[PDB]
């Protein structure tokens, strides 16, 4: 409201070393079972290996690049009407937005295990396809189509 | 209103005569005349045209 904060970081990657990566393990983590999150966010790259090849490190971020937006809109009421003024999202929440929408679809795959339900979307990005990547450009639709605002 | 000024560029300067017309002299009109409403406000703004 009238106060300001910084950020709530935590223990990074268990070994591959990657602070932000933790989010992918947290954001996805449910019922506070991080002990299992590491069992999914890690085993995931162990499967994309043969899938992609090059360091799973890049593999992630690689396709991830085709999932992170860069411009959204925020409802702002004025004189009764509430415009949808656009706004370019900084990297901080950008990368986050992706992970959210990414892990989501993965849990909507509706197949069997998540380990695979996760890799699919992790690669579906680069090759382009899936619900996750969908939102990416889907957001672009609302974007600019309202450029008449901001 | 007129504009020529050479020298390659495109800064602005569209503010020259601007402060002597614009949507101001226009907004001044367009809608029904004031008739009596001016003699009041145009002479009520003076109340502030002092302090």
């Amino acid at each position: 409201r009238r106060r300001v904060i910084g950020q709530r970081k935590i223990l990074p990657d268990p070994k591959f070393g990657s602070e932000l990566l933790a989010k992918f393990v947290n954001i996805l983590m449910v019922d506070g079972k991080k002990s299992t999150a590491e069992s999914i966010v890690y085993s995931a790259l162990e499967t994309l290996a043969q899938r992609s090849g090059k360091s799973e490190l890049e593999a992630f971020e690689v396709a991830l690049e085709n999932v992170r937006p860069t411009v959204e809109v925020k409802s702002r009421r004025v004189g009764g009407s509430t415009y949808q003024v656009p706004v370019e999202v900084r990297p901080v929440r950008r990368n986050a937005l992706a992970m959210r929408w990414i892990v989501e679809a993965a849990r909507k795959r509706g197949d069997k295990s998540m380990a695979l339900r996760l890799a699919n979307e992790l690669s579906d990005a680069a090759e382009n396809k899936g619900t996750a990547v969908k939102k990416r450009e889907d957001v672009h639709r609302m974007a600019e189509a309202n450029k008449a605002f901001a | 209103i007129k504009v020529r000024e050479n020298e390659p560029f495109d800064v602005a300067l569209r503010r020259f005569k601007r402060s002597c017309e614009k949507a101001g002299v226009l907004a001044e009109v367009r809608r029904r005349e004031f008739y009596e409403k001016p003699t009041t406000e145009r002479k009520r703004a003076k109340a502030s045209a002092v302090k």
């Binding site: 605002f149 | 809608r31 029904r32």
Partner: protein, 117 residues
Amino acid sequence: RKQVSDGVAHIHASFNNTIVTITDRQGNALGWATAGGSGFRGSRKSTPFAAQVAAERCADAVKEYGIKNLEVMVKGPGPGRESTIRALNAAGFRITNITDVTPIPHNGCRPPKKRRV
């Protein structure tokens, strides 16, 4: 086609819409751009960021004649009175005499009342 190189382009900025008509040198249409027919309208149109797209849209519908240096004529307080111009100084078009015509009667007519929202 005819090749003028030296033409004009008046800007009609109305509070609700705006149209960019690139005329020749003696006052002859050559292509008109309209904010309304820009794939968007209503509350989306009118705005500068939008109503301007029409102006610069003239190029791929006017330059077919071939023009370089030119002046500009603005007439209308519409929300694009200026925005529209920039598109011209970025679409490749040169620039020359930029004068505002926008009419102003010396107190003759009588505008309508209304506006009781």
